[PDB]
């Protein structure tokens, strides 16, 4: 479990999503080091120019790569081969919602997250469909609690998206994680995340991401 | 324990070899008590790009007959209602990689397979269809690995070639149980297999009929 995350690990991410009838597919590749808790990834939209801004998708697209301090090592559920299912419901205040299901598992020596995403009730001329969101990401605290009944995790947090007019767009995240494999459960704690979005060079619509994540509480 | 008596089988195959993809479906009956399988396979896409004998191994070891003495080592039935993944090396030719889930849906037994084929050179026995439409008899060696709570198997298959050459396929197999139940591990033992491939006068479509006999020993 924990033992697979020592050293650099290759990541593959595939996202299959439809928002308001607009289907699109995204793929990402890169490396992550759990010891430093760093993620470096490149994302490409195979299907064309995205109907939705890149910052909206970020959370959906590797928590396991969060760095748990040695005292906190007992509470790292994510690391805890078979992998897990990550399901999220995302509410954009004054706008539509995301419902997503994902499986994070190990295929060969590569770590893979494949995702299915559905988008509903999103307004035209809204921040999201408008692409009025700034190409950046802020820093957040992800609150984690244990859910014994589903022998799994639950998480709650709200994301802040900067808007070009200087407004702030809030996305409410409701998250639960359950394990594919048989046979770990953590006291309440949180993840502290910082993210940077950059560009390549590439013609295709794309995203480049750097993520530092560490646990506390 | 589900086996006693005849059990229905359904098999569906989604496979691609060297960019040539195809889908195969099969139906029939098997009873573990006799260790007998009766099945008919149909090629829904159209004509096969690969010989039928190549597919046979990848096409439910649960139906093997374990003697009263051997019942303690039958992993397949215990896991009912497992995952079977295999790597197949054809000598002086390409390779097969497959993933499978063998499970019970209703009272019917189902095997669903995913197969990808690579590196098979053109003008070769497999692409060429130089394989005789027949199957020989083989021994499948099974070992347990507690680390994945499962069994592993190794054997090599012999495929007849029309000129009298023999084509060898090396099988590396791993089985793991979907259910949390055990599914308890077996001591080293083997399965003895005999197979007959037949055809149906009446079927328009490309098809295979096989009358599989399998029993275990130590």
């Amino acid at each position: 479990g924990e033992e697979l995350f020592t050293g650099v690990v290759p990541i593959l991410i595939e996202l299959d999503g439809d928002v308001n009838g607009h289907k699109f597919f995204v793929r990402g590749e890169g490396e992550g080091d759990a010891t430093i808790g760093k993620l470096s990834l490149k994302f490409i939209a195979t299907t064309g120019k995205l109907p939705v801004p890149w910052p909206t998708l970020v959370t959906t697209l590797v928590q396991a790569f969060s760095r748990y301090p040695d005292h906190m090592k007992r509470h790292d559920f994510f690391k805890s081969p078979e992998g897990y299912v990550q399901e999220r419901t995302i509410y954009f205040k004054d706008d539509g919602t995301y419902k997503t299901r994902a499986e994070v598992k190990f295929e060969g020596d590569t770590l893979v997250n494949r995702i299915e995403l559905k988008g509903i009730d999103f307004k035209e001329d809204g921040n999201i469909l408008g692409h009025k969101l700034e190409y950046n990401f802020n820093s957040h605290k992800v609150y984690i609690t244990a859910d014994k009944q589903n022998n799994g995790i639950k998480a709650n947090f709200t994301i802040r998206h900067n808007v070009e007019d200087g407004s702030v767009q809030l996305a409410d995240h409701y998250q639960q994680n359950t394990p594919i494999g048989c046979g770990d459960l953590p006291d309440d704690h949180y993840l502290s995340t910082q993210t940077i979005l950059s560009k390549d060079n590439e013609k295709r619509d794309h995203m480049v991401l750097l993520e530092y994540v560490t646990a506390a509480g």
Side-chain angles (χ1 to χ4, degrees), chain A residues 1-41 43-78 80-217:
Chain A
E2 166 192 309
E3 322 215 303
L4 298 150
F5 289 103
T6 63
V8 192
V9 185
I11 302 110
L12 167 72
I13 301 164
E14 293 197 349
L15 194 146
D16 188 271
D18 166 30
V19 182
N20 267 348
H22 296 79
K23 297 187 66 181
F24 58 97
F25 187 93
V26 182
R27 165 176 292 109
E29 302 177 33
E31 313 152 13
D33 195 331
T35 44
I36 192 53
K38 158 171 167 187
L39 283 88
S40 174
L41 307 172
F43 296 84
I44 306 126
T46 63
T47 176
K49 191 170 281 193
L50 291 184
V52 68
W54 281 103
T56 46
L57 300 164
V58 183
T59 52
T60 299
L61 304 134
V62 291
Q63 306 218 275
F65 278 102
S66 178
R67 158 172 102 77
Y68 274 73
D70 305 83
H71 48 272
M72 290 218 92
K73 210 83 78 184
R74 303 296 304 169
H75 307 257
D76 191 342
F77 165 92
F78 313 96
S80 167
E82 305 84 310
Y84 58 77
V85 169
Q86 187 170 291
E87 300 180 290
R88 220 174 245 150
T89 310
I90 309 185
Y91 299 85
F92 293 79
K93 300 301 290 187
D94 305 322
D95 213 327
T97 77
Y98 279 175
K99 220 288 184 169
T100 71
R101 195 201 180 255
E103 310 177 335
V104 184
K105 44 186 170 190
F106 264 104
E107 293 177 350
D109 262 328
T110 302
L111 174 59
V112 190
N113 187 335
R114 292 178 179 83
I115 311 151
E116 277 172 17
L117 177 148
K118 326 163 235 166
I120 295 169
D121 300 278
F122 289 100
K123 308 291 141 203
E124 303 210 338
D125 313 314
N127 291 325
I128 316 169
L129 285 179
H131 299 58
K132 290 151 154 195
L133 295 194
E134 275 163 47
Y135 182 77
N136 57 45
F137 216 80
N138 294 318
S139 314
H140 311 93
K141 264 190 205 293
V142 172
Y143 291 105
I144 302 195
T145 185
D147 168 32
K148 166 62 206 171
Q149 299 210 51
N150 298 157
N151 69 305
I153 294 323
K154 288 198 167 254
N156 310 81
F157 55 99
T158 75
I159 297 279
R160 323 163 157 161
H161 292 130
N162 281 27
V163 187
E164 295 279 15
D165 69 346
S167 63
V168 64
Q169 168 81 57
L170 292 166
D172 286 343
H173 287 52
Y174 292 92
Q175 159 180 344
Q176 71 181 10
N177 293 76
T178 77
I180 312 281
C182 301
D184 194 355
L185 250 57
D187 288 333
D188 306 348
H189 68 291
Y190 64 78
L191 272 51
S192 167
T193 75
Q194 321 192 70
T195 314
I196 293 187
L197 278 37
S198 37
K199 291 271 156 137
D200 289 345
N201 60 40
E202 183 65 13
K203 184 261 199 311
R204 275 163 313 171
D205 194 351
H206 63 295
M207 189 189 146
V208 180
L209 175 158
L210 196 33
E211 238 187 78
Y212 178 73
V213 181
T214 175

